[PDB]
Amino acid sequence: AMIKRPIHMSHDFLAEVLDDESIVVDATMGNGNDTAFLAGLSKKVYAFDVQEQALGKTSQRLSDLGIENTELILDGHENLDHYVREPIRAAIFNLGYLPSADKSKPHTTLEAIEKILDRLEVGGRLAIMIYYGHDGGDMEKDAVLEYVIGLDQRVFTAMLYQPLNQINTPPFLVMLEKLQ
Amino acid sequence: AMIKRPIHMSHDFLAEVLDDESIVVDATMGNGNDTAFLAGLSKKVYAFDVQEQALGKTSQRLSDLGIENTELILDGHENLDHYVREPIRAAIFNLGKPHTTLEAIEKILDRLEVGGRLAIMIYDMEKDAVLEYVIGLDQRVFTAMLYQPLNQINTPPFLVMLEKLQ
């Protein structure tokens, strides 16, 4: 019942609409933190990553937890539409900085996001965790943010959840829900 | 179970730490929406407003709801410290003079219990100053979270969530 770090809030947010019939997409497997958590709460989790290493780690990890209801895919997440034929209840991305395009082709991640939004059930949710980190970034020139801001409020509700008072610049969360 | 509007989030944020032993401060009574909600969930609510009409409106309401565990005060919230002698479990401030606003927020933070919460709903010099104040807080002492709508065309209210750690 602590004030939630952005990661705990992403987990809470998605868990809230999950059930034993739910299809979930983990767009950025990495070390499998979100997959390991979401799989126990849904029917099936599809997780994507571009690195063999993250597959191998996540696999042994889910194996050690006895988690079977997943499909780990070695493919860019902009190709989710090829593997996921079901309606999608919840999805999650963990992102770094994506600079808004020079207005003088959307980034592959933007393409995966829209493909997720298109496929979300009504009531379904997309958590986007973003961490600029050491490398640095700018929230006023952020492609994900620019895209989310531009979504039609009648179709989607989009919320920013972010730490205000931390010295090193922390991750922040985008919460999306489909309205119709 | 809806994606939460800032107000809904602020109400739930506060409810999470409340019990029948809790003292609550409502720094900005207005029509009574927050007082009506939080009274039900706590030992006592102190509510402040500078306007007679806010008092009369809230009274009638609370009365109609059978709610008797409030102290409705006609005074500036910067003087909260003269009416509220107890530790504060939960507080709410509805924004939209800056010196009195800041004074009221500090007085509340100073008096929150560890684990205690302040929700600031912001609807301009006042708003920038409250925000820099919060951004400035020691992260070892307070956690400060922003909860804000992104894709609304008309600029809507947002929420600042504060929790005392030590």
Q: Smallest CA–CA separation between A55 and chain B, in Å? A: 33
* Method used to solve the structure: X-ray
Instruction: Determine contact, residues B126/B101, Cβ cutoff 8 Å.
Output: yes
Closest chain B residue by Cα to residue A149: B151
Q: For chains A and B, what is the number of CB pairs under 8 angstroms?
A: 71
Task: Please give the structure tokens belonging to residue A41.
Answer: 């709460």
Q: How far is Cα A6 from Cα A4, in angstroms, rounded to an integer?
A: 6
Task: Please give the structure tokens belonging to residue A51.
Answer: 């690195």
Q: What is the 3-state secondary structure (H, E, C) of B78-131?
A: HHHHHCCCCCEEEEEEEECCHHHHHHHHHHHHHHEEEEEEEEEEECCHHHHHHH
Partner-chain residue, chosen from B145, B151, B152, that has the shortest CB–CB distance to A164 = B145
Contact B147 A160 (CB under 8 A): yes
Contact B136 A174 (CB under 8 A): no
Q: How far is Cα B26 from Cα A127, in angstroms, rounded to an integer?
A: 33
Q: Does B141 touch chain A (CB under 8 A)?
A: no
Summarize chain A as % helix, strand, coil (round to 5).
35, 30, 40
CA A127 from centroid of its chain's CA atoms: 5
Task: Map out the domains of chain A with their CATH numbers.
Answer: 1-180 (3.40.50.150)
Q: Smallest CA–CA separation between A173 and chain B, in Å? A: 10
The CA angle B117-B121-B123, to the nearest 5 degrees, is: 170
Partner-chain residue, chosen from B135, B138, B149, that has the shortest CB–CB distance to A159 = B149
Q: Does B50 touch chain A (CB under 8 A)?
A: no
Q: How far is Cα A66 from Cα A124, in angstroms, rounded to an integer?
A: 27
Contact B151 A158 (CB under 8 A): yes
The DSSP 8-state label assigned to residue B150 in this structure reads: S
Closest chain B residue by Cα to residue A3: B163
**C-alpha pair distances (Å), A30 with each of A10, A39, A176, B132:** 16, 15, 22, 36
Q: How far is Cα A90 from Cα A15, in angstroms, rounded to an integer?
A: 8
Element holding B64 (H helix, E strand) = helix B52-64
Query: Kind of pairing, strands A172-178 and B44-49?
Result: unpaired
Q: Smallest CA–CA separation between B155 and chain A, in Å? A: 12
Which residues, 6+ apart, have CB-to-CB distance to B66 below 8 Å? none
**C-alpha pair distances (Å), B143 with each of A17, A27, B65, B94:** 27, 29, 34, 19
Rounded to whole angstroms, the maximal C-alpha distance in chain A is 51
Q: Smallest CA–CA separation between B56 and chain A, in Å? A: 35
Closest chain A residue by Cα to residue B117: A3
Residue to mutate among A165, A173, A180, with most B CBs inside 10 A, is A165
Q: Does A77 touch chain B (CB under 8 A)?
A: no
Closest chain A residue by Cα to residue B119: A3
- Count of CB atoms within 10 A of residue B147's CB? 22
Look at residues A11, A63, A18 and name the one whose alpha carbon lies nearest to residue A37. A11
Q: How far is Cα B94 from Cα B162, in angstroms, rounded to an integer?
A: 14
Which residues, 6+ apart, have CB-to-CB distance to A111 below 8 Å? A78
Element holding A160 (H helix, E strand) = strand A156-163
User: To one decimal place, what's the resolution in Å?
Assistant: 2.0
CA B60 from centroid of its chain's CA atoms: 21
Q: Return the axis-axis angle of helices B125-136 and B98-111, rounded to nearest 10°.
A: 30
End-to-end, the C-alpha distance of chain B in Å comes to: 32
Chain breaks in chain A (C to N over 2.5 A) after: 104
The DSSP 8-state label assigned to residue B60 in this structure reads: H
Instruction: Supply φ then ψ for residue B87, to 5 degrees.
Output: -60, 150
Buried b (16+ CB within 10 A) or exposed e, B27-60: bbbbebbbbbbbbebbebbbbbbeeeebbebbee
Chain breaks in chain B (C to N over 2.5 A) after: 96, 123
Q: CA torsion sign, B85 to A3 to B102 to B41? A: negative
Residues of A in contact with B147 (CB under 8 A): 159-161
Task: Please give the structure tokens belonging to residue A63.
Answer: 């194996």
